Amino acid sequence: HWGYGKHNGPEHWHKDFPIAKGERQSPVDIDTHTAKYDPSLKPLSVSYDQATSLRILNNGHAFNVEFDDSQDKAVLKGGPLDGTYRLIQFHFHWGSLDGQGSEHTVDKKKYAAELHLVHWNTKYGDFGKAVQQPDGLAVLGIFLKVGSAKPGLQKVVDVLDSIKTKGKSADFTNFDPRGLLPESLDYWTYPGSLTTPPLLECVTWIVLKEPISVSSEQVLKFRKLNFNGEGEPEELMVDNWRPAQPLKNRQIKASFK
Ligand SMILES: N#CCCN(CCc1ccccc1)CC(=O)N(CCc1ccccc1)CCc1ccc(S(N)(=O)=O)cc1
Ligand SMILES: [Zn+2]
Numbered sequence: 001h002w003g004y005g006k007h008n009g010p011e012h013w014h015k016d017f018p019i020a021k022g023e024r025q026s027p028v029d030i031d032t033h034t035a036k037y038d039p040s041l042k043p044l045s046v047s048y049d050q051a052t053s054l055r056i057l058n059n060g061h062a063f064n065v066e067f068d069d070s071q072d073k074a075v076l077k078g079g080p081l082d083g084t085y086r087l088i089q090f091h092f093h094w095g096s097l098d099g100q101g102s103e104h105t106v107d108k109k110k111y112a113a114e115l116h117l118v119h120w121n122t123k124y125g126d127f128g129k130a131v132q133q134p135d136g137l138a139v140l141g142i143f144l145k146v147g148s149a150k151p152g153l154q155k156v157v158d159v160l161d162s163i164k165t166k167g168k169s170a171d172f173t174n175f176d177p178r179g180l181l182p183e184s185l186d187y188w189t190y191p192g193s194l195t196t197p198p199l200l201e202c203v204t205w206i207v208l209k210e211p212i213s214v215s216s217e218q219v220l221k222f223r224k225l226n227f228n229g230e231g232e233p234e235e236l237m238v239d240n241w242r243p244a245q246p247l248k249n250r251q252i253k254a255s256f257k
Contacts, residue, residue: 002197003061003227010242017197024201025245026192027103030252035188038253044185044206045078046140046178051087053175056159060166060227061196062091062240065156065175069120069127074177076119076138079206079255080189085119085138088127090177092116093195094222096238098146103195103241104207106143111211112219113144114241115180116195134191136202142182142212149215152179157221166229182210186256195242209256 002008002016014020051074055066066089067074074087094113095101102111117140120130130136144150155175162170186209193201225237 004240013197013199017199019193019199019201022193022199022201023248024191024193024250025199026195026203026205027105027242027244028190028192028247028250028252029105029108029244030188030207032107035252035254037257038255041080041189041253041255042078043255044076044140044187046076046181046185048074048087048176048178050074051175051177053172053177055169056156056163056172057169058163058166058225058237060229062093062237063160063163063225064089064091065172065177072122076117076140076206079187080204080253081138081206082135084122086122087117087119087177090115090117090180092144092222093241094144094219094238095241096223096236098216098219100239101241102143103244104141104143104205105244111143112146113214113222115142115144115212116140117142117177117180131194131200131202133202135204137194138204138206141205141207142180143208144214144219145211146216146219147213149218150180150212152176153214153218157218160221160225164224164230165226165232168230180212182208182212184208184210186210186254188252188254190250190252192250 052068102114124130
């Protein structure tokens with residue numbers, strides 16, 4: 001099955017998922033000099049005060065912090081979006097070294113990791129229906145660079161020992177995702193896709209310009225996770241990122257001058 005290795009990685013995905021070579025694939029390189037300021041874009045509205053986290057899961061490709069999305073509790077609105085998008089989960093992509101790990105790049109620069117806060121358009125009723133729609137999802141992407149620790153990330157870091165291997169989950173209630181945001185909500189936006197199989201072209205990408213800083217020790221703990229299940233040979237969960245895909249007939253818009 002698909003993964004991030006030599007024999008099942010991104011260059012192989014198109015055989016099972018031909019949309020891998022489609023017209024609106026993600027991630028992409030964000031060329032900052034070519035992105036155009038769009039004064040029509042509204043400020044983002046991130047309303048996470050009532051978020052209800054439930055569980056953290058190692059799914060064999062990353063780890064997901066899952067939320068209760070059966071009501072409008074933590075929602076994303078505004079910016080390029082029409083309607084209300086409910087937070088369902090967040091996860092990260094990261095590298096084996098501090099100079100790689102992000103999926104999006106900025107003027108070809110790779111960050112150490114990238115956080116994805118995944119939201120779905122409530123007009124489609126459930127997440128499975130939303131992924132079948134060109135405007136079904138909104139993913140808020142946030143770059144991580146290595147420097148000072150992010151205090152709001154530590155509760156995630158400290159539970160990773162309990163979900164080392166594929167298929168392990170742990171209770172993860174009362175986690176506040178507002179502690180993972182940078183100061184500025186300035187962003188770039190473009191129409192794209194899920195960055196893993198099934199690579200569905202259902203995502204409005206909103207990528208924040210300002211990275212958050214995490215410590216070397218925090219990212220080192222991400223790198224102790226495993227792709228494998230328990231009782232299988234250890235394969236470290238590192239370099240779980242897809243590289244930049246062709247922009248094709250798309251324009252990246254900036255919320256800021
Ligand atoms: N069992 C099992 C796992 C099944 N998942 C969903 C469970 C679900 C939840 C609500 C309603 C229906 C189904 C599957 C699941 O999540 N994805 C697969 C596509 C999908 C979505 C919904 C239904 C079928 C397939 C999305 C995974 C995904 C990939 C990449 C990014 S990224 N890097 O672009 O942000 C974000 C999220
Ligand atoms: Zn992702």
